Design a protein around this motif. Sequence first.
Motif, PDB file in Angstrom:
ATOM      1  N   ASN A   1     -50.938 -52.900  -3.615  1.00  0.00           N
ATOM      2  CA  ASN A   1     -50.370 -51.587  -3.340  1.00  0.00           C
ATOM      3  C   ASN A   1     -50.600 -50.670  -4.532  1.00  0.00           C
ATOM      4  O   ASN A   1     -49.934 -50.800  -5.565  1.00  0.00           O
ATOM      5  CB  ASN A   1     -48.869 -51.726  -3.039  1.00  0.00           C
ATOM      6  CG  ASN A   1     -48.209 -50.403  -2.671  1.00  0.00           C
ATOM      7  OD1 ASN A   1     -48.797 -49.333  -2.815  1.00  0.00           O
ATOM      8  ND2 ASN A   1     -46.971 -50.476  -2.204  1.00  0.00           N
TER       9      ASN A   1
ATOM     10  N   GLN B   1     -50.609 -47.333  -3.897  1.00  0.00           N
ATOM     11  CA  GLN B   1     -50.232 -46.065  -3.275  1.00  0.00           C
ATOM     12  C   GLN B   1     -48.906 -45.539  -3.785  1.00  0.00           C
ATOM     13  O   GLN B   1     -48.743 -44.342  -4.017  1.00  0.00           O
ATOM     14  CB  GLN B   1     -50.133 -46.244  -1.761  1.00  0.00           C
ATOM     15  CG  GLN B   1     -49.635 -45.011  -1.035  1.00  0.00           C
ATOM     16  CD  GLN B   1     -50.652 -43.891  -1.058  1.00  0.00           C
ATOM     17  OE1 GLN B   1     -51.546 -43.841  -0.214  1.00  0.00           O
ATOM     18  NE2 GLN B   1     -50.528 -42.991  -2.030  1.00  0.00           N
ATOM     19  N   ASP B   2     -47.951 -46.441  -3.965  1.00  0.00           N
ATOM     20  CA  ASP B   2     -46.624 -46.031  -4.387  1.00  0.00           C
ATOM     21  C   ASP B   2     -46.563 -45.990  -5.906  1.00  0.00           C
ATOM     22  O   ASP B   2     -46.794 -46.997  -6.577  1.00  0.00           O
ATOM     23  CB  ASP B   2     -45.570 -46.980  -3.818  1.00  0.00           C
ATOM     24  CG  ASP B   2     -45.602 -47.043  -2.302  1.00  0.00           C
ATOM     25  OD1 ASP B   2     -45.921 -46.017  -1.656  1.00  0.00           O
ATOM     26  OD2 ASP B   2     -45.306 -48.124  -1.752  1.00  0.00           O
TER      27      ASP B   2
ATOM     28  N   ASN C   1     -47.109 -57.338  -6.708  1.00  0.00           N
ATOM     29  CA  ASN C   1     -47.213 -55.923  -6.373  1.00  0.00           C
ATOM     30  C   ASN C   1     -46.203 -55.066  -7.119  1.00  0.00           C
ATOM     31  O   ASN C   1     -46.519 -53.941  -7.518  1.00  0.00           O
ATOM     32  CB  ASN C   1     -47.100 -55.702  -4.865  1.00  0.00           C
ATOM     33  CG  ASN C   1     -48.442 -55.539  -4.211  1.00  0.00           C
ATOM     34  OD1 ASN C   1     -49.343 -54.914  -4.772  1.00  0.00           O
ATOM     35  ND2 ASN C   1     -48.588 -56.092  -3.018  1.00  0.00           N
ATOM     36  N   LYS C   2     -44.996 -55.595  -7.315  1.00  0.00           N
ATOM     37  CA  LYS C   2     -43.991 -54.893  -8.104  1.00  0.00           C
ATOM     38  C   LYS C   2     -44.475 -54.715  -9.539  1.00  0.00           C
ATOM     39  O   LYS C   2     -44.361 -53.630 -10.109  1.00  0.00           O
ATOM     40  CB  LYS C   2     -42.662 -55.649  -8.068  1.00  0.00           C
ATOM     41  CG  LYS C   2     -41.548 -54.964  -8.844  1.00  0.00           C
ATOM     42  CD  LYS C   2     -40.241 -55.734  -8.705  1.00  0.00           C
ATOM     43  CE  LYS C   2     -39.135 -55.105  -9.542  1.00  0.00           C
ATOM     44  NZ  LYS C   2     -38.722 -53.776  -9.026  1.00  0.00           N
TER      45      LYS C   2
ATOM     46  N   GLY D   1     -47.184 -52.228  -9.765  1.00  0.00           N
ATOM     47  CA  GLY D   1     -46.552 -50.917  -9.748  1.00  0.00           C
ATOM     48  C   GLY D   1     -46.118 -50.465 -11.122  1.00  0.00           C
ATOM     49  O   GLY D   1     -46.354 -49.313 -11.502  1.00  0.00           O
TER      50      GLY D   1
ATOM     51  N   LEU E   1     -52.150 -57.809  -0.080  1.00  0.00           N
ATOM     52  CA  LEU E   1     -52.664 -56.439  -0.102  1.00  0.00           C
ATOM     53  C   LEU E   1     -52.155 -55.701  -1.329  1.00  0.00           C
ATOM     54  O   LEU E   1     -50.978 -55.365  -1.400  1.00  0.00           O
ATOM     55  CB  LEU E   1     -52.206 -55.695   1.158  1.00  0.00           C
ATOM     56  CG  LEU E   1     -52.789 -56.178   2.483  1.00  0.00           C
ATOM     57  CD1 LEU E   1     -52.088 -55.494   3.650  1.00  0.00           C
ATOM     58  CD2 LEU E   1     -54.279 -55.909   2.529  1.00  0.00           C
TER      59      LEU E   1
ATOM     60  N   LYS F   1     -52.551 -39.455  -0.628  1.00  0.00           N
ATOM     61  CA  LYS F   1     -52.778 -40.611   0.240  1.00  0.00           C
ATOM     62  C   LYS F   1     -54.079 -41.351  -0.042  1.00  0.00           C
ATOM     63  O   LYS F   1     -55.153 -40.746  -0.103  1.00  0.00           O
ATOM     64  CB  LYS F   1     -52.729 -40.191   1.715  1.00  0.00           C
ATOM     65  CG  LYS F   1     -51.327 -40.189   2.301  1.00  0.00           C
TER      66      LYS F   1
ATOM     67  N   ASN G   1     -45.265 -60.369  -3.476  1.00  0.00           N
ATOM     68  CA  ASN G   1     -44.390 -59.216  -3.596  1.00  0.00           C
ATOM     69  C   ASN G   1     -44.053 -58.944  -5.059  1.00  0.00           C
ATOM     70  O   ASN G   1     -44.031 -57.789  -5.480  1.00  0.00           O
ATOM     71  CB  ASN G   1     -43.124 -59.399  -2.759  1.00  0.00           C
ATOM     72  CG  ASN G   1     -43.397 -59.344  -1.264  1.00  0.00           C
ATOM     73  OD1 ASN G   1     -44.455 -58.883  -0.826  1.00  0.00           O
ATOM     74  ND2 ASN G   1     -42.442 -59.821  -0.472  1.00  0.00           N
TER      75      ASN G   1
ATOM     76  N   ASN H   1     -57.973 -44.878  -8.015  1.00  0.00           N
ATOM     77  CA  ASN H   1     -57.301 -46.029  -7.422  1.00  0.00           C
ATOM     78  C   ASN H   1     -58.064 -46.596  -6.232  1.00  0.00           C
ATOM     79  O   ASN H   1     -58.210 -47.811  -6.095  1.00  0.00           O
ATOM     80  CB  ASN H   1     -55.879 -45.652  -7.006  1.00  0.00           C
ATOM     81  CG  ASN H   1     -54.937 -45.575  -8.187  1.00  0.00           C
ATOM     82  OD1 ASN H   1     -55.370 -45.588  -9.337  1.00  0.00           O
ATOM     83  ND2 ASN H   1     -53.644 -45.506  -7.910  1.00  0.00           N
ATOM     84  N   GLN H   2     -58.563 -45.712  -5.377  1.00  0.00           N
ATOM     85  CA  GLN H   2     -59.256 -46.158  -4.173  1.00  0.00           C
ATOM     86  C   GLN H   2     -60.578 -46.843  -4.524  1.00  0.00           C
ATOM     87  O   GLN H   2     -60.897 -47.899  -3.979  1.00  0.00           O
ATOM     88  CB  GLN H   2     -59.471 -44.974  -3.228  1.00  0.00           C
ATOM     89  CG  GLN H   2     -60.145 -45.359  -1.920  1.00  0.00           C
ATOM     90  CD  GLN H   2     -60.081 -44.255  -0.897  1.00  0.00           C
ATOM     91  OE1 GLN H   2     -59.005 -43.737  -0.582  1.00  0.00           O
ATOM     92  NE2 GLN H   2     -61.239 -43.874  -0.375  1.00  0.00           N
TER      93      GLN H   2
END
Lengths: 157, 157, 157, 157, 157, 157, 157
Positions: free
Chosen positions: F70, F72-73, F12-13, F16, F68, A76, F9, A23-24
């Motif tokens: 995401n 991470q989640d 990003n959802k 995800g 940005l 993280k 937003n 991912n990074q």
Amino acid sequence: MKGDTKVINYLNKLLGNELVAINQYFLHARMFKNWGLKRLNDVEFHESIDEMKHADRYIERILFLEGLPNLQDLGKLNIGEDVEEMLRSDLALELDGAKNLREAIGYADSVHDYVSRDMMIEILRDEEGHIDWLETELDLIQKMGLQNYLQAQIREE
Amino acid sequence: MKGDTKVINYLNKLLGNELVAINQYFLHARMFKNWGLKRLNDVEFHESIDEMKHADRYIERILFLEGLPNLQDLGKLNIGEDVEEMLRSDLALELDGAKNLREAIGYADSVHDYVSRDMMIEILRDEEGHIDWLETELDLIQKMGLQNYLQAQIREE
Amino acid sequence: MKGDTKVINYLNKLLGNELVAINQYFLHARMFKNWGLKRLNDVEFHESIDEMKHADRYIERILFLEGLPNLQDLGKLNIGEDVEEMLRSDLALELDGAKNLREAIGYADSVHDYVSRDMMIEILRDEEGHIDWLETELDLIQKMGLQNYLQAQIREE
Amino acid sequence: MKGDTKVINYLNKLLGNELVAINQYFLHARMFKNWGLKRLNDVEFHESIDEMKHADRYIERILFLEGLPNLQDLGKLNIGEDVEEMLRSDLALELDGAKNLREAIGYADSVHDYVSRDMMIEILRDEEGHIDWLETELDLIQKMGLQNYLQAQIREE
Amino acid sequence: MKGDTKVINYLNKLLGNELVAINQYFLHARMFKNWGLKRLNDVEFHESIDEMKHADRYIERILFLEGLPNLQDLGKLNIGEDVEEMLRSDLALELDGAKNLREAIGYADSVHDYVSRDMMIEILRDEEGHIDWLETELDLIQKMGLQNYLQAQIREE
Amino acid sequence: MKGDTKVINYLNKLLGNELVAINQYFLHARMFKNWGLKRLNDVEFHESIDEMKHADRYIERILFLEGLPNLQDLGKLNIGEDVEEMLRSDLALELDGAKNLREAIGYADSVHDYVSRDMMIEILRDEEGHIDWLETELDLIQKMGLQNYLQAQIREE
Amino acid sequence: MKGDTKVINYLNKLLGNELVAINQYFLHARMFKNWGLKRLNDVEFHESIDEMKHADRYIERILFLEGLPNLQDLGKLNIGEDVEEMLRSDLALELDGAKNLREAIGYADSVHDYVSRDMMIEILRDEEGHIDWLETELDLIQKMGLQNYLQAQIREE
């Protein structure tokens, strides 16, 4: 073929490291692409694919050994906001992952899982290659200056 | 065919020079490679190979003339740790070697070893080519600055 | 990437072995060539190149690990003046080098430098191949006699 | 198709002979290879493969005739320690096997298993070819002497 | 090159395991062929060839190390009479062989025979592949039932 | 080019959702591979790659719009333990993602981000294709029985 | 086919925007060419061509809808005198054009001219591409400095 429980736990930990790196590296590649730094997009994209292949090897090995691959718990990320920060973050992640590989490789030998060890040594060899590339790029930024370094990334190699 | 003993001694001295240059150019090449300066790795590696070819010519000539090639004694290497210093060290070695070649070429003529002289003149032509390249690169560092110079080495030519 | 200092010292010791072998094999090759033993020139030249490749691997590994490759110190060559003596000298050097490789491979494992170990095991496999060839050639000299053995070297294989 | 019990017993006896020869030829081949006698490695390896094909034919025929191939009982190998000894042992084994084949071929005819007989006659023709080769090589050792004979084996043909 | 006596004894034990497997896989293959189960004939034949290659590596290594390969003593075959029995027997044999390999690999490391160890790890990797295939096929028989499983074997894949 | 905050937003959802699907499809593929169900490994691997391509498009669009991404989640995976459970979980995930896409597409239109909408409609078309495939496979289990269905997956299509 | 009068008016407005951009991009390209900035000549020339293709689509659509394309009224050009001013002017023009496109796309949907809308969304996608390129170049000027940026334009990419 039922594997050693602790070896499987190591393989899941290492798989976890690879999932973070996939991912990074991928996000870094596309940030570089957005900025027009085509060379860095190309290399970092390739690095993400490399970590995907590593993840695949771990998943297949864990399943063979009758364990459950954990793709749910993502560790993280450390994205960074400029080229130097991003490359340094990738380098730090690689070094952390290498430490974990060394521990797992030693343990696998102790319980005679020599095939898992062989797989992990090949992966460690790849990771040290990534480390070499990242260290070299970071040193080039310092040697030629950021302006020249950025100029050198705008065309594909 | 028994050759002139002093000519053979010159050929061994020149071989000795080549042996130092082979090692110095090769180590320099791989230092440049480690630093990501691909162009300099390529040229310096090629220079190392050229000196290997010269060493081969000396070895074969000495053996034909019934002498004993000396590959045991290795003269002083001057490695250095920055690009300019490394290139200046290679230049100094080339200039010292050219002086020795001129002496040997004159002596070979005096004892009528015209084939050894012919071989050495071809080698001296090669060495003056290396001198030209080194001098030019050093001047380029001064003229465009080291930062620009380094940037110009990262891609293979 | 800063490596283990004692590992780097082993790598320099092994590099030192390779540097002796490169010169010894190359001089032997050209002696065989001068004598018209084309097959032996071909194989020994190839062996010299193989040792050059090994030296390159050590140099690149040492530089990656942030050590200083030592190409200055050259150990004892044992040239010899007849075919059997020359091959026996190469065999002795290979056996001495294999002993050093085994020590280094064990030490590298103990400090978890598994990539250096992997590299050295591949090199040791190559060296055992050379040992096999040398042992076999020496036995062939005994079994068919030197005169037949020499006759068998004049044409390239 | 239910075959004659004694024919099946003969086929199992002959299969047994082939199993011994496969192993003996293969070990001999690799002994020759270790000694650098490439030509003998090549021929003896091919003879081992020939016997493997014969074994396959026996196994398939036995299964067609509803018998049980016996690959469990392995008869006595006679390896030998030098080239003449090895070739003589191979020759002795071939001659013993040919005796068995002749008996089986006659019996198969008497019970009208003409397809098994046809198969066995083809195999016997192959075995007589091996006998011819072995006899010829053994005579060549005597005629040209062992030293010349060994020299003649070091290159592939 | 004189090897460690106990390493050679391990290599002979492992060679013995391979010799049993070669015969068992080959007979199983031809049983499957006789029954018209072409897919299983193909895979099991390939497995027999894999074990032949392993046996060759052991034989060559033992000879290099100046030991005597033992192809005389054949261990117990367990053939079986139906597909599930046959596959389970192959699996049991592979698992027994893997145990022996792990012991040998550990021992080889302890006496610094790293090349023999490297060879054995590669072979163990092959054997774990066979184990995976066998386990998977046996599970498929359970999941889809024997009749469907057999239907799936009559064509080559 | 600065985009609408709520559109970002939504992107990003949706990103995800794709990240969950990449991992779930990939693990499912390799579970199928482990089980020997090659057809399902092939399709599910292809679906994982499709979702990677979707994630890439979201990442690139978010970056263009100066947001940005995401990564991470990571939302909940539902792996499952048998073929039907796995396929049903993939279908439920696709249906949940389709609902989110429909909401996002309507909103993007309302703030005139027609290029983000165009991208999302293409992705939704792809997702409906996956839904069609999953529904069809699940119905095939119902129509032919699980054992027949499993047999049908063992060969690549 | 009789089109909606206001749709035709929007298409003429957008055509007007394209006509300005064709001229501005073309003159910019040739200014860059005159200055020796070959890369910028190439990209800006291709941008002018892209706008010509857009203009062609508007003209053809207007004529299909039985309106009268207006190529007579040319809006304000803002040429600029240096690279940054020129690129900023192109970016400003693109952003103004995108505003007009969004309004037209919404209106076309509301009166059900979905084919004109489809055409306009494709054109908007192209314009957002130009916007991305222009923004990226302007940022690169800041990041590497004007002198490096100009150097990077002298060769074709």
